Amino acid sequence: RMSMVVSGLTPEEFMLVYKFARKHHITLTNLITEETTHVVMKTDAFVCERTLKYFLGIAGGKWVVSYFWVTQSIKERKMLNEHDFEVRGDVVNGRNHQGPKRARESQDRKIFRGLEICCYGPFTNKPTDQLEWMVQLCGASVVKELSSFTLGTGVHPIVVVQPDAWTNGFHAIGQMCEAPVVTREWVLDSVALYQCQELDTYLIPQIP
Ligand SMILES: [Co+2]
């Protein structure tokens, strides 16, 4: 019916969110799931920091909503419509380039459509599986080893390394395959703005 999670709040603020849910017969989870409907985010007056849940929130085209949505509904003895209340960036996108918009409204076409992503070698900040499940969420196709791209002329393939996580071999990925090596940052920024971005700024020196 309606399931909720929330990001970058203090307990003081959590309190309300609880008592907001409680009031309007809503369920609550600490852990973003496939079955969630809403992500609630701290802001500024509508700009959020960049949480893991931020991404999978958009990833989903769920309701990605700033906190004010709720303190304003407590105030006004009633729930407000969500459609007047979603977030509009962080740092990738300023107040400028609202993402969750497209996300929610798109879906019938995803932003990874017919691609193949391999999240290659060490991660940390945001660890492999979620990363994959992320792109997997917006219709990318997930490979485990470079040695599994079904090039089959048709589909386009990508490697994504997180660069720093490994302590200097990731120049020599081109030494195994004929997809490009974009950097994690490609995914993230692409999923924030929910366009599919330009590998240009994100490619990694591939060394014969
Ligand atoms: Co092409």
Computed from CA positions of residues 184, 185, 188, 193, in that sequence, does the dihedral angle turn out positive or negative? negative
27 CB-near residues (< 8 Å, 6+ apart): 1, 2, 3, 4, 21
CA 156 – ligand 1 centroid, Å: 6
CA 158 – ligand 1 centroid, Å: 12
CA 196 – ligand 1 centroid, Å: 13
Range of the domain at 156: 107-208
182 neighbors 158 (Cβ within 8 angstroms) = yes
Run of H or E including 131: helix 128-137
CA 160 – ligand 1 centroid, Å: 18
Written as one string, the DSSP assignment of 4-38 is: EEEES--HHHHHHHHHHHHHTT-EE-SS--TT--E
Resolution in angstroms for this experimental structure? 3.6
CA 149 – ligand 1 centroid, Å: 15
Instruction: Give the pair of three-digit tokens for residue 13.
Output: 């603020």
CATH number at residue 57: 3.40.50.10190
Indicate if 89 and 158 belong to the same structural domain: no
Domain final residue, candidates 84, 106, 128: 106
CA 121 – ligand 1 centroid, Å: 25
CA distance 63 to 159: 30
Indicate if 113 and 75 belong to the same structural domain: no
CA distance 75 to 169: 56
CA distance 45 to 36: 25
The experimental method is X-ray
In angstroms, the Cα distances linking 32 to 3, 35, 99, 167 are 9, 8, 18, 31
Indicate if 65 and 114 belong to the same structural domain: no
The beta-strand segments (E) located in the chain are 3-7, 27-28, 38-41, 63-66, 115-119, 140-143, 156-161, 181-183
Strand partners, 143: 118
CA 154 – ligand 1 centroid, Å: 8
| Radius of gyration of the chain from its Cα atoms, rounded to whole angstroms | 19
Domain final residue, candidates 106, 134, 168: 106
Choose among 200, 114, 115: nearest CA to 159.
115
CA 151 – ligand 1 centroid, Å: 11
CA 179 – ligand 1 centroid, Å: 11
CA 197 – ligand 1 centroid, Å: 14
Structural domains counted in the chain: 2
Ramachandran area for residue 113 (φ above 0: left; ψ -120 to 50: alpha; else beta): left
Ramachandran area for residue 89 (φ above 0: left; ψ -120 to 50: alpha; else beta): left
Indicate if 4 and 70 belong to the same structural domain: yes
Q: Is 207 exposed, middle or buried (0-12, 13-18, 19+ CB in 10 A)?
A: exposed
Instruction: Give the pair of three-digit tokens for residue 68.
Output: 């004010």
Instruction: Give the pair of three-digit tokens for residue 118.
Output: 């391999």
CA 116 – ligand 1 centroid, Å: 12
Q: Is 125 exposed, middle or buried (0-12, 13-18, 19+ CB in 10 A)?
A: exposed
Choose among 49, 97, 25, 45: nearest CA to 6.
49
In angstroms, the Cα distances linking 2 to 27, 107, 134 are 7, 19, 22
